[PDB]
Curated annotation (Swiss-Prot), chains A, B:
Muscle-specific filamin, which plays a central role in sarcomere assembly and organization. Critical for normal myogenesis, it probably functions as a large actin-cross-linking protein with structural functions at the Z lines in muscle cells. May be involved in reorganizing the actin cytoskeleton in response to signaling events. Residues 4-96 are annotated as: Self-association site, tail. The chain holds residues 2633 to 2725 of 2725 of the full protein. It is found in: Cytoplasm; Membrane; Cytoplasm, Cytoskeleton; Cytoplasm, Myofibril, Sarcomere, Z line. Filamin repeats lie at residues 4-95. This is Filamin-C. It comes from Homo sapiens (Human). Silenced in MKN28 and MKN74 gastric cancer cell lines due to aberrant methylation of the gene. Belongs to the filamin family.
Length: 96, 96
């Protein structure tokens, strides 16, 4: 479809709610039903920034996202399709 | 500083204006003077999505961004600090 519809994006995985220092933290963002746009991911650390963010297209606008963190705390994960928040965003991520 | 100021983000590199199929395309996003927020990157392909997007923190909220593309065309690259476009965004990227 020509346009886009963020409400049709489906996001799931452990990295939506918890992340660990020293590990890869991941989730899937399925934009296959949402039209044509850019998927954007941001991780807000209140004190220390996110170290790596990696977004891999798996086909059909299904993406795997992996990210890493360096410090414990409560982070906020934002996933957008264009300028529009996908269902569930912002996500609260605990780094224990 | 507690808040944030997208207007202080400095973005530079070849990947802001051109990207090649089969290569890593890169630029630096220097957020060291912009306070505390998430840096978000999106690459809009009108026909075929961006394959990989990778954002690496280099220290002091200076980031290296690398991305890959699969199809020729004119792409749009968006760089945000929080929900605010950084100077220069949106960037027009030719994939020849």
């Amino acid at each position: 479809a020509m346009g886009s519809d963020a409400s049709k994006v489906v996001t799931r995985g452990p990295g939506l709610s918890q992340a660990f220092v020293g590990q890869k933290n991941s989730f899937t963002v399925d934009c296959s039903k949402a039209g044509t746009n850019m998927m954007m991911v941001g991780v807000h650390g209140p004190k220390t920034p996110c170290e790596e963010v990696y977004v891999k297209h798996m086909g059909n606008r299904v993406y795997n996202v992996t990210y890493t963190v360096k410090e414990k705390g409560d982070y906020i994960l934002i996933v957008k399709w264009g300028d529009e928040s996908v269902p569930g965003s912002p996500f609260k991520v605990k780094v224990p």
